[PDB]
Amino acid sequence: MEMEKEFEQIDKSGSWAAIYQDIRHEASDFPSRVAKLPKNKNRNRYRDVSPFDHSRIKLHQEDNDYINASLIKMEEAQRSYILTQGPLPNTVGHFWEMVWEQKSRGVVMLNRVMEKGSLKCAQYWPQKEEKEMIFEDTNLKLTLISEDIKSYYTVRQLELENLTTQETREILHFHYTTWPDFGVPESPASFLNFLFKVRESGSLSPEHGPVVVHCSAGIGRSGTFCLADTCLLLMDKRKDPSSVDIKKVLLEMRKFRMGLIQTADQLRFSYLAVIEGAKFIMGD
Ligand SMILES: CCOC(=O)[C@@H]1CN(C(C)=O)[C@H]2c3cccc(C)c3O[C@@H]12
């Protein structure tokens, strides 16, 4: 069923809450035993948001390999994403260790450091060229190379150095700065312009490791970004773009991380983004 007609049918019937609860009921439940070990309590931002054991990213260290991060591997679309929480004061070194070890080119940030008057994630990148950051626990150095501030997003060029080998890599930081403190954007225009700036950079392409995507918990805004990207890629690949079922794609993604799309309004926004986005994939 053409999703644009499914959309109008749910809107006219006002059934978004019902559709969303059906997804919650059918979603996968896999063990997260490593996330719940006592040694890992200060590595989790939220007690109710944990990576599954089967899909969690492992740090390359014998001490403690745990980070709150999941590999979302989309087999038909040929895309992979790492979805993670906003870094905590004691996990900023782990965060950059993961980017290094997984060979990521891009980090996608969908929150502000402060929202609703509370801290939603650590200040984990440098704000001035001449004030670099050193992560002594993981032996990494991080330098701000350039910053491009736009109305709806900021792009930063960062240099990450493995101090153990003196290898360096260029990381791109894509920071969506205008998601509202409450609810979802009235239009999906800026978020879609943003997704396509990430695509144009190479950060989502198979010559690199998976993109790292986060918000505060790494499930709500983060889930909207990967869901919209994968649905648009499937529409460009299939003979019948109308066969793409956003609810079925979301349930596939929920096999790899719990809770993706946190509200009925985020579900409606994801439909709007794919619909309004589709009016280009198809040749405009
Ligand atoms: C309400 C939605 O309309 C939009 O804002 C555009 C829709 N779209 C796609 C991929 O469908 C994005 C896009 C593609 C190329 C260039 C731009 C500046 C751009 O912005 C988004």
Domains: count for the chain: 1
Q: What is the best residue among 151, 187, 193 to mutate for testing ligand 1's pocket, by most ligand atoms within 8 Å of CB?
A: 193
CATH number where 141 lies = 3.90.190.10
Between CA 138 and CA 261 the distance in angstroms is: 32
State the distance from the centre of ligand 1 to the C-alpha of 218, rounded, in angstroms: 24
Q: In this structure, how many other beta carbons lie within 10 angstroms of the beta carbon of residue 188?
A: 22
How remote is the CA of residue 229 from the centroid of ligand 1, in Å?
A: 12
User: Which of these, 127, 135, 53, 54, lies nearest to 100 by C-alpha position?
Assistant: 135
In Å, what resolution does this model reach? 1.6
What angle (nearest 5°) sits at the alpha carbon of residue 273, between those of residues 271 and 4?
45
Binding pocket residue ranges, ligand 1, CB within 6 Å: 187-189, 192-193, 196, 276-277, 280
Pocket test for ligand 1, best of 153, 229, 276, 280 (most atoms within 8 A of CB): 280
CA 137 / ligand 1 centre spacing (Å): 41
69 is in an annotated binding site: no
Q: Measured from the CA of 279, which atom of ligand 1 is nearest?
A: 11
- The answer to the question of whether 231 is labelled as a binding residue is no
Domain range for 276: 1-283
Q: How many angstroms separate the CA atoms of 44 and 90, rounded? A: 10
Residue type, 135: F
**Dist. CA 152 → ligand 1 center (Å):** 13
What is the biggest distance separating any 2 CA atoms in the chain, rounded to whole angstroms? 60
Report the nearest atom of ligand 1 relative to the CA of 188.
1
Our answer to whether residue 231 is catalytic in this structure is no
**If you compute the radius of gyration of the chain from its CA atoms, what whole number of angstroms results?**
19
